[PDB]
Design a protein around this nucleic acid. Structure first.
Ligand SMILES: *OCCCCCCNc1c(NCCOCCO[C@H]2O[C@H](CO)[C@@H](O)[C@H](O)[C@@H]2O)c(=O)c1=O
Ligand SMILES: *OCCCCCCNc1c(NCCOCCO[C@H]2O[C@H](CO)[C@@H](O)[C@H](O)[C@@H]2O)c(=O)c1=O
Ligand SMILES: *OCCCCCCNc1c(NCCOCCO[C@H]2O[C@H](CO)[C@@H](O)[C@H](O)[C@@H]2O)c(=O)c1=O
Ligand SMILES: *OCCCCCCNc1c(NCCOCCO[C@H]2O[C@H](CO)[C@@H](O)[C@H](O)[C@@H]2O)c(=O)c1=O
Ligand SMILES: [Ca+2]
Ligand SMILES: [Ca+2]
Ligand SMILES: [Ca+2]
Ligand SMILES: [Ca+2]
Ligand SMILES: [Mn+2]
Ligand SMILES: [Mn+2]
Ligand SMILES: [Mn+2]
Ligand SMILES: [Mn+2]
Lengths: 237, 237, 237, 237
DNA sequence: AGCT
DNA sequence: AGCT
DNA sequence: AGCT
DNA sequence: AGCT
């Protein structure tokens, strides 16, 4: 199956698979059972920002999720991604709903990756920035229920015409180009991802969450991965 | 056929298809017969730099080609690319040889494109920078004789084991992601490309040249486009 | 006197010094009497965006001023800045009021300048981006009535405690670092500036405007340059 | 006195002030006695690269120093710079010689700093890149013996016409603009610095080293700070 | 830019 | 490299 | 682009 | 929120 590294914004506690009993952010290394979590004060109907960073010096994957004028949540985990991911990856956003639901609306997404060669000390870099999504966004691979262009946003999961989120939905968007995320012959490598999101639910319990993820290039939504599996994992192992 | 906009670095005068009688840089709009040329003092065996710029305000495609401590060649042409290219494109480098030959070696390639929306005044951007090419460069589409990784360079046309360039060769490299090069609903848009190149010919007269090009996403090398057609055009019309 | 190149967003027609009879954008080369103008449909109380671009290949100074979901105004003028400005400059924003008034509020300002050496083909670059201004913004030189930090904005001209703009006010903000805007030994050079602005007038007719300008490093507000002189020029010559 | 945070490339063991008995890289927090060091295989006469990184999420200052095709040295130290530096700083390079000497030649210097506001989630950024230094580099403050333009390089300490380094020399270069390095109201902040250097000595023991530093804006070379104090500290406390 |  |  |  |  696929190889996944992800930062999850998990709106729904699935205590049966080791979620904490509160909405949380997590670092997922090849499992939906986060290697590290932090409590997250998700604000229903508010636009939030997620920031994810990693470099090959510290080998610490860190995320910050925040809303304007509120305290941020942060989670960090030490991991050598050279030992986890393939050298070449795709990067993407994923989201799901299950019995309970929410909008999984992405208003912006940026990514930057850099590799400096040990042999020449010259740098290879990729950067993309989406502040608006068009109805035909040819540099995004849309999987499952994901759609673009509705008010210039990326709707990862199904929403009705009047903005009501639907249950049992999963969708993802991957950047078209493969990304060279590590190289043994690189002296320094880094990436950063940022996205803005709007999670809104009429349900007393919103579900299930949004994730930024890094995968094998040919990654697809695993069969059955609605709800707690966030469109990333084939099972809850 | 494909739709091509290109900046040619033409090392071989084909006077029978309207080339000037000297090595030259040109702007090619849907024809190998340049809309505009400038004289180019190509320096056999020296690393040079090409810089290509366009924005939606001036709608003037401009190029500068130079070698360190020499005077540059510059060519400009007014063209509304909204009336020539599809909205979504790929960008690439092309080169060819014919009965005369040369190395068509690319040492670096960078590209930046930006679109600012009329409705939100927010910007979408893409940037890539290759200062080294690997043996398996998954974010490049290699066509024809193009190879990567030989001394960390992109060799657009065939070079033998003994290092000598081959005749009748054509090759191209395209960036994997489609590029949104214009949008009627963009208030301002721009792109810039830069590459560094090394053209070496032992065989007296070098041929045929290198081009930076913008094409339909599904562009392929036209069959028989060796020599004066520079891997870009199916004929000399 | 100082040496000024500016893009004016002129909200008040001064027909006695050669303004057109409508609010307009202009290119000012060493005179308040614009070398080129375009009609500008200024929208009282709306946030707008100005984009200014120049490169050493085309030597065409261009500006686009627009509001979301409205048609832009654009103005261009061919000028070799090597023959007008000193090699080293400061860049700034200026605004004024006179017997008529307006808020001259700056919400964001970004600037990028690049110089590529003819001898090495290596690039020197400067970039700054202000999306918020603090009460003590040590990388800005504030002149005249300019203040920062009020709602995170840069107020170029005086606004009273009750929020109403004052007449006969002039103020400017310059970036602290000198900028190398041209070099004879540069093979390619460029700059771009962007700012967002909010011009509000209760007093019927708004005056006088905002300008982006480039000056000698030691530029100061010319004494008496309120009203039609836009904080840039000592007289209307 | 001044407040200094520095990354030292220390070529000369001063065991009397707690240097290790080998050339080393160090993190200096308000003292020449490094809070952390790593062994450094300095290569006399070779061009090296230094990379320094910090962000407000991890609050870990890290450096990597390397030469092409050799193993890098890395040093990291956990420090909350909000508790060390003033909010506004200058950034610079410093170097010294004493009884023993070396060239302290800087071939390139880049710096990037970003602050994201907790209230708006908008970013303020500064970036500069010097790949060549001119004889009159108006955006650098040169202190002590530092000179620019000799072969397009920054010579931090004194060198003769034939390239022979001089003893008892100290010099620094600071970027002209103040830098907003931390803000309590910033949700995420980062900086990165890179420079390339050429340390060459005819002496069996080269001395004394190069440092990247962050200081109070009005920082000057302390009296007597040649040799082991690297132009940064007034004493060896 | 619109009213006298 | 000097000083104990 | 230079030699016959 | 259900299941023990
Ligand atoms: O009355 C509303 C109050 C809050 C309700 C939250 C329940 N608390 C709770 C659960 N229990 C249920 C485990 O989830 C069952 C539903 O499973 C389906 O729906 C979810 C959400 O969409 C999805 O994750 C699943 O995959 C599945 O589709 C806890 O463990 C806990 O805490
Ligand atoms: O100052 C510049 C002088 C350089 C040589 C000028 C022309 N040399 C030349 C020609 N010219 C006729 C056209 O070329 C015929 C050969 O055509 C094949 O080779 C070229 C080069 O690779 C290619 O462009 C064509 O498409 C074709 O493959 C000669 O016959 C000769 O010698
Ligand atoms: O469609 C556009 C119509 C807007 C009003 C047109 C003119 N209005 C106007 C004039 N015109 C004469 C010139 O202005 C005289 C006042 O001058 C002072 O005020 C202006 C504005 O702040 C300033 O530019 C000058 O430098 C001076 O401070 C009137 O007299 C009147 O009413
Ligand atoms: O024959 C050469 C072999 C290597 C010589 C290195 C000495 N080893 C050593 C020292 N001892 C001397 C302490 O430094 C004395 C000189 O001080 C002056 O020169 C240095 C270098 O320029 C400078 O740092 C000082 O500030 C002063 O100007 C150790 O402690 C160690 O190891
Ligand atoms: Ca969950
Ligand atoms: Ca040709
Ligand atoms: Ca006016
Ligand atoms: Ca030392
Ligand atoms: Mn979870
Ligand atoms: Mn041609
Ligand atoms: Mn005017
Ligand atoms: Mn030390």
């Amino acid at each position: 199956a696929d190889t996944i590294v992800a930062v999850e914004l998990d709106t729904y506690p699935n205590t049966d698979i080791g979620d904490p009993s509160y909405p949380h952010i997590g670092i997922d290394i090849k499992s939906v059972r986060s290697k590290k979590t932090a409590k997250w004060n998700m604000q229903n109907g508010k636009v939030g920002t997620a920031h994810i960073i990693y470099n090959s010096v510290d080998k610490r994957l860190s995320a910050v999720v925040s809303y304007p004028n509120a305290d941020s949540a942060t989670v960090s985990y030490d991991v050598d991604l050279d030992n986890v991911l393939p050298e070449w990856v795709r990067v993407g956003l994923s989201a799901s709903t299950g019995l309970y639901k929410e909008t999984n609306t992405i208003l912006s997404w940026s990514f930057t990756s850099k590799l400096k060669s040990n042999s020449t000390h010259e740098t290879n870099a990729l950067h993309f920035m989406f502040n608006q999504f068009s109805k035909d966004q040819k540099d995004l691979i849309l999987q499952g229920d994901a759609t673009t262009g509705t008010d210039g946003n990326l709707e990862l999961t199904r929403v009705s015409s009047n903005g009501s989120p639907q249950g049992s939905s999963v969708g993802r968007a991957l950047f078209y180009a493969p990304v060279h995320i590590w190289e043994s012959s690189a002296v320094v490598a880094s990436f950063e991802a940022t996205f803005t999101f709007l999670i809104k639910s009429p349900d007393s319990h919103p579900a299930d969450g949004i994730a930024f993820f890094i995968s094998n290039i040919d990654s697809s939504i695993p069969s059955g991965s609605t709800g707690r599996l966030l469109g990333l994992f084939p099972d809850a192992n």
